[PDB]
Amino acid sequence: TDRVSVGNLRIARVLYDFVNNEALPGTDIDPDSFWAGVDKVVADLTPQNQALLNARDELQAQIDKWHRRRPIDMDAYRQFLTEIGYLLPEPDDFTITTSGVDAEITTTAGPQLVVPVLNARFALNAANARWGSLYDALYGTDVIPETDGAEKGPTYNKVRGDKVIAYARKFLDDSVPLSSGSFGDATGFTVQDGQLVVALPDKSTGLANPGQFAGYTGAAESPTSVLLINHGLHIEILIDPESQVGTTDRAGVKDVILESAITTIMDFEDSVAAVDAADKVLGYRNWLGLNKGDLAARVLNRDRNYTAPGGGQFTLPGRSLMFVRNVGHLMTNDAIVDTDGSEVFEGIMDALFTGLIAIHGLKASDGPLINSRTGSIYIVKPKMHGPAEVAFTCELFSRVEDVLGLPQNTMKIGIMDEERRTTVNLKACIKAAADRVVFINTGFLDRTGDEIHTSMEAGPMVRKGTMKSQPWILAYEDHNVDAGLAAGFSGRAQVGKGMWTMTELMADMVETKIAQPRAGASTAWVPSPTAATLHALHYHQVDVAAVQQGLAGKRRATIEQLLTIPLAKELAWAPDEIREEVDNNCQSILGYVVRWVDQGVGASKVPDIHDVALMEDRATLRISSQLLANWLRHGVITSADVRASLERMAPLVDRQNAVAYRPMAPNFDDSIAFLAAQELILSGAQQPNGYTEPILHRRRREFKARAAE
Numbered sequence: 001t002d003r004v005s006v007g008n009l010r011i012a013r014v015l016y017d018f019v020n021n022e023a024l025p026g027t028d029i030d031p032d033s034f035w036a037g038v039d040k041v042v043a044d045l046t047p048q049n050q051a052l053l054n055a056r057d058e059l060q061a062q063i064d065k066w067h068r069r070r071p072i073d074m075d076a077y078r079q080f081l082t083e084i085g086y087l088l089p090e091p092d093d094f095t096i097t098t099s100g101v102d103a104e105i106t107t108t109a110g111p112q113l114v115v116p117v118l119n120a121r122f123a124l125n126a127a128n129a130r131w132g133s134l135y136d137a138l139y140g141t142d143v144i145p146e147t148d149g150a151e152k153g154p155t156y157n158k159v160r161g162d163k164v165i166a167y168a169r170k171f172l173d174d175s176v177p178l179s180s181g182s183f184g185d186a187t188g189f190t191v192q193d194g195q196l197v198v199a200l201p202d203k204s205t206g207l208a209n210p211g212q213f214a215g216y217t218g219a220a221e222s223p224t225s226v227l228l229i230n231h232g233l234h235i236e237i238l239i240d241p242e243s244q245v246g247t248t249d250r251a252g253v254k255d256v257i258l259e260s261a262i263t264t265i266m267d268f269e270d271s272v273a274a275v276d277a278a279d280k281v282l283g284y285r286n287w288l289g290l291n292k293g294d295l296a297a298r299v300l301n302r303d304r305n306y307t308a309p310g311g312g313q314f315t316l317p318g319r320s321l322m323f324v325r326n327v328g329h330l331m332t333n334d335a336i337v338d339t340d341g342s343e344v345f346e347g348i349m350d351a352l353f354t355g356l357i358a359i360h361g362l363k364a365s366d367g368p369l370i371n372s373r374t375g376s377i378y379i380v381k382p383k384m385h386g387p388a389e390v391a392f393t394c395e396l397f398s399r400v401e402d403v404l405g406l407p408q409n410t411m412k413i414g415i416m417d418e419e420r421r422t423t424v425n426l427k428a429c430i431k432a433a434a435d436r437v438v439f440i441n442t443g444f445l446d447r448t449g450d451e452i453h454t455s456m457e458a459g460p461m462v463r464k465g466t467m468k469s470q471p472w473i474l475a476y477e478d479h480n481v482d483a484g485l486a487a488g489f490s491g492r493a494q495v496g497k498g499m500w501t502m503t504e505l506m507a508d509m510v511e512t513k514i515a516q517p518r519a520g521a522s523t524a525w526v527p528s529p530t531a532a533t534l535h536a537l538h539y540h541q542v543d544v545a546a547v548q549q550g551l552a553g554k555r556r557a558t559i560e561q562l563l564t565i566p567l568a569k570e571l572a573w574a575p576d577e578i579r580e581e582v583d584n585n586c587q588s589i590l591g592y593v594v595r596w597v598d599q600g601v602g603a604s605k606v607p608d609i610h611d612v613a614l615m616e617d618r619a620t621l622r623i624s625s626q627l628l629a630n631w632l633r634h635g636v637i638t639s640a641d642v643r644a645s646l647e648r649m650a651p652l653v654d655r656q657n658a659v660a661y662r663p664m665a666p667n668f669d670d671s672i673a674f675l676a677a678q679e680l681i682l683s684g685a686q687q688p689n690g691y692t693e694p695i696l697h698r699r700r701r702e703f704k705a706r707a708a709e
């Protein structure tokens with residue numbers, strides 16, 4: 001049955017082959033030892049993996065019943081959570097010891113880009129998004145309004161181009177002030193006696209802070225570019241009067257380049273659909289090509305050469321420092337099954353295989369080694385529930401390092417704070433990984449899904465749009481930063497915040513997302529290289545190091561605030577508001593699911609009911625489906641409502657697509673994608689912590705089975 005037997009494991013051939021032929025060569029790991037290690041780790045850790053998952057269910061069951069036997073008494077609730085071991089004692093102050101970490105993580109505040117690893121083109125663009133064109137980002141998005149004269153068309157619009165230029169000139173004034181005058185009036189740049197001199201019409205000036213001059217390229221007397229630094233982030237002015245844009249520019253400037261995506265996370269989790277060995281291998285292979293530096297659709301950037309102010313030479317990293325996000329503890333995958341046909345835990349597999357693969361990024365790739373020069377491997381672990389689950393992940397990494405022959409603590413962990421039991425025990429979760437943790441991050445999307453599911457039995461929840469402003473989530477965000485800073489994250493590890501999902505609303509992002517660095521986050525998530533470039537603006541405006549220093553020692557969220565369930569208040573909605581929420585959620589669910597199930601796309605732009613293009617993934621799906629499950633559970637809507645709305649929105653989703661796309665309508669009961677969507681809602685309450693993978697995986701697998709015949 002094209003599997004390979006190794007001890008108790010039966011490994012899908014396509015995987016076995018990939019590891020032996022592509023992943024193992026060059027790591028100096030004996031293949032047979034590797035596989036014996038896989039067998040041993042899986043056998044040793046599977047029981048504890050299962051025990052943890054069972055505890056989740058048991059805790060949820062107790063909470064469910066507590067709510068059913070019930071102006072919620074928060075004192076009794078908190079006492080109950082403590083009794084059942086949900087809420088655990090907060091450990092004594094400590095400082096993390098994680099070491100051997102690159103500066104991009106310890107010190108540099110800036111955007112963090114997340115990309116589906118299964119998409120090689122996206123993944124390449126992401127690795128290369130460390131440097132990005134500010135002009136392109138402004139010209140190509142709505143940051144520059146398409147007012148009269150400034151609209152985009154087939155050809156270059158000089159009116160729009162001029163606006164882009166002026167926008168950038170102001171950025172320069174704000175970020176790297178001249179001693180006198182504005183960059184808007186610059187006629188030239190030179191380097192004199194190690195000093196940047198900016199020519200203005202009437203005179204010449206230097207930088208208000210000469211320390212911001214980092215280097216240049218070309219002749220000092222008329223550089224081809226000028227390199228500045230601000231808040232640790234680089235800005236490069238490209239000087240080319242011969243260019244199209246350059247010829248029109250008052251100083252011959254062709255573009256302004258921003259260091260953007262300082263780190264990137266190659267995602268195996270919520271933004272990809274990978275339900276079997278073939279899918280996994282496609283992902284593992286891209287991860288491998290990124291680490292070996294030979295992935296090509298277009299190729300990976302080399303480092304950048306500069307001349308220092310003084311005249312000597314130096315270089316800067318040309319690539320985004322790469323993390324890999326493994327899947328969490330929940331799912332099994334049949335890429336490997338045991339003797340009895342039981343699927344093996346996917347998270348365990350990811351640690352072994354992405355860990356193995358990551359070794360290549362630590363060594364030269366005929367060209368310099370592509371990733372960590374300090375010797376670390378950076379893995380994000382999502383969807384953990386509490387300190388025992390974190391300790392488990394660390395033990396897993398420890399065992400994997402042994403199998404990989406890596407120094408202990410090589411595998412660093414970025415901890416998602418995106419489950420309620422982690423939020424309320426965050427200090428203990430960090431402590432559990434005190435020598436491995438390189439970031440914490442508020443995955444607010446999953447966190448919201450978990451919020452809804454945990455309190456499913458308490459009553460009807462507020463509408464999805466209301467969640468972002470609820471007390472529980474505001475406390476959760478502050479609490480995360482507090483715990484991070486108290487654990488000595490400043491200068492040691494990232495304090496990160498969540499994803500911007502409205503890919504077309506870049507004007508909105510630029511005005512809104514500045515709140516994250518202002519909240520003391522040294523990084524926050526963006527969906528694209530363009531978005532990374534625009535979000536980078538915020539880090540030039542905000543001095544995150546300063547903000548963090550000022551936040552130190554503060555306790556801004558109480559346990560009682562974290563525990564505030566987002567219950568709706570009686571009669572909160574008119575019938576039309578209820579129908580809109582239902583229709584909106586159904587359309588978003590159907591839009592995402594149809595492409596997940598039919599085409600194996602784990603992240604899709606799906607226009608919502610207000611026609612806003614929303615980037616959907618499993619987390620946004622978990623919210624939508626859990627909310628409708630909650631509303632159905634408490635009588636806000638009927639089973640006829642759900643069905644009618646699904647049936648109503650489906651044809652609209654069909655029309656929003658109409659590509660290699662199959663329609664769901666009119667034969668709904670025969671559409672696997674339709675049935676998946678339906679199931680996500682009607683079975684939502686019974687899904688473990690409201691997770692969507694069990695259904696999505698089963699249905700995708702069903703679609704694949706059907707398509708092969």
Ligand SMILES: O=C(O)c1c[nH]c2ccccc12
Pocket residue numbers: 114115267270271443445499500501527603615616617619620
């Ligand atoms: O939920 C996550 O962790 C996501 C990773 N890449 C994305 C793109 C759009 C919305 C959510 C995510």
Ligand SMILES: [Mg+2]
Pocket residue numbers: 064
């Ligand atoms: Mg029950």
Ligand SMILES: [Mg+2]
Pocket residue numbers: 270382416418443445446619
């Ligand atoms: Mg998440």
